[PDB]
């Protein structure tokens, strides 16, 4: 079957020199992750359940 899942809020982007700052406002434990698109991705993974930057 297909299960309906929510979409989290689009995070508030603000851009610094070689930095993206996100403000993350979850309703429920929400997986935040990122990686670099280079040869060394250094993947980050976090279940964000608190309103956090």
């Amino acid at each position: 079957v297909t299960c309906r899942v929510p979409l989290a809020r689009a995070p508030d982007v603000t851009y610094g020199k070689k930095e993206v700052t996100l403000r993350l406002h979850p309703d429920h434990p929400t997986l935040f992750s990122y990686r670099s698109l280079g040869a060394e991705p250094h993947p980050y993974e976090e279940w964000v359940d608190k309103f956090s930057e």
Binding site: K18, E19, R35, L37, G38, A39, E40, P41
Partner: protein, 438 residues
């Protein structure tokens, strides 16, 4: 007519190849990679899924004894407990107070939905890369799929293209791969026949339809408690149902070079690694004769503005003579700056504007409009916007030209110091000569 190029293996980067076939007006081809798909050759090692533990009703023999037997069943356990006196709801089950036994028997089986919810453990090697390339030139504007090897020639409008062997051996898949539904995992799974209780592969099957099964789940029976009919046992919980929560996020969130991982078949899409040679055979119907082309002459270049930004941040005006209006191929003969357009309309107004992208403080690329050639020198300011939602349209060549300001200062300082050093040398040589004659 053979020609060759080498396009970046960058999706949506519209590399432009310029062909200067001496009998014809030049042409620029645009070669944009629409997709790539790096697909490993997979050999299935085994299937893993949740186990089912079969625990039949206990064979309680009242007033008598029983004997266990070995059976050809995975992780099978069987023990006879002597001196049981079980009570059912209405009273003791046996009339004999201690002359009874319970045969406790349990064994492991493949779960009933392992047909549907299983993880397949693979060895992944010898990956083949297929790319989808968009070819456009003149009136032809077409998308084609080609295997990226020096062998698969593909037709486009009567041209033939060979997209030569990818200039790397890299692939994101390790030698051992676990595939599960939409996910892929780099995981050094244990060999078949070698899985351990409560870890991935605590039961293993060579195929889904295999009748045999390896199982090592640490199933142990223990004695029925005094007065109860229950077959009490202990077993390490299914290593697959542990894995399913221990997996973390799949290779799709961790692969280098921005690869996007997909299953059915297992492939890494749109990796940004290496470069793709191209061999191009172009028919005489694709070119235009030099008698028909415009005689673009006295071409000159001036740069209106330049930003070394990731978009086409530079603008140039090219000025020329021509005999007739027409279309010319236009190209930048230096990787320091990539043009946006492949062709430009030439008119008796005698000037036109061309847009380029560059990564250097002062590029000195050179451009052609048809057969004419000119050099463009720019002073390029940095961008102000720190971050952008799109990749660089330039080749990231950042070293400034020797005519640029930084290198002009370097040249002035170097020739000043070296000229003084050569003065000191000439003086010392003339002194040592004269004081040798003395």
């Amino acid at each position: 007519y053979e020609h060759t190029a080498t396009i970046p293996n960058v999706v949506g980067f519209p590399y432009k190849a310029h062909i200067e076939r001496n009998g014809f007006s030049p042409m620029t081809l645009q070669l944009e990679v629409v997709e790539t798909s790096l697909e490993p050759t997979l050999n299935l090692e085994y299937i893993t899924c949740e186990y089912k533990t079969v625990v039949p009703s206990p064979f309680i023999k009242c007033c008598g004894t029983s004997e266990c037997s070995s059976k050809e069943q995975p992780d099978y356990q069987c023990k006879v407990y002597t001196g049981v006196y079980p009570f059912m709801w209405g009273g003791a089950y046996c009339f004999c107070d201690s002359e009874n036994t319970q045969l406790s028997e349990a064994y492991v089986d493949r779960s009933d939905v392992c047909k549907h919810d299983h993880a397949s453990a693979y060895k992944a090697h010898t990956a083949s890369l297929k790319a989808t390339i968009r070819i456009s030139y003149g009136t032809i504007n077409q998308t084609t799929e080609a295997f990226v090897n020096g062998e698969h020639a593909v037709n486009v409008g009567g041209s033939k293209f060979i997209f030569g062997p990818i200039s790397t051996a890299w692939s994101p898949f390790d030698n051992k791969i676990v595939v599960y539904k939409d996910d892929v995992y780099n995981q050094d799974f244990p060999p078949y026949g070698s899985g351990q209780p409560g870890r991935f592969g605590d039961i293993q099957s060579r195929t889904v339809e295999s009748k045999d099964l390896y199982a090592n789940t640490a199933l142990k029976l223990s004695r029925p408690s005094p007065g109860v009919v229950h077959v009490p046992y202990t077993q390490t919980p299914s290593g697959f149902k542990y894995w399913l929560k221990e997996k973390g996020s799949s290779l799709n969130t961790k692969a280098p070079f921005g690869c996007k991982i997909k299953t059915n078949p297992v492939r890494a899409m749109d990796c940004a690694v290496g470069s793709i040679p191209v061999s191009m055979d172009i028919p005489d119907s694709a070119f235009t004769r030099v008698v028909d082309a415009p005689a673009v002459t006295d071409l000159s270049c001036q740069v209106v503005v330049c930003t070394h930004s990731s978009d086409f941040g530079g603008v140039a005006t090219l000025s020329y003579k021509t005999d007739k209006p027409g279309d010319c191929a236009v190209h930048s003969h230096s990787n320091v700056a990539t043009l946006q357009e492949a062709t430009v309309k030439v008119k008796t107004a005698g000037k036109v504007t061309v847009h380029f992208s560059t990564a250097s403080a002062s590029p000195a690329f050179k451009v052609s409009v048809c057969d004419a050639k000119t050099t463009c020198t720019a002073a390029c300011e940095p961008p102000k916007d720190h971050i952008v939602p799109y990749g660089a349209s330039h080749n990231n060549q950042v070293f400034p030209d020797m005519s640029g300001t930084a290198m002009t200062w370097v040249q002035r300082l170097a020739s000043g110091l070296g000229g003084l050093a050569l003065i000191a040398v000439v003086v010392l040589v003339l002194v040592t000569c004269i004081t040798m004659r003395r």
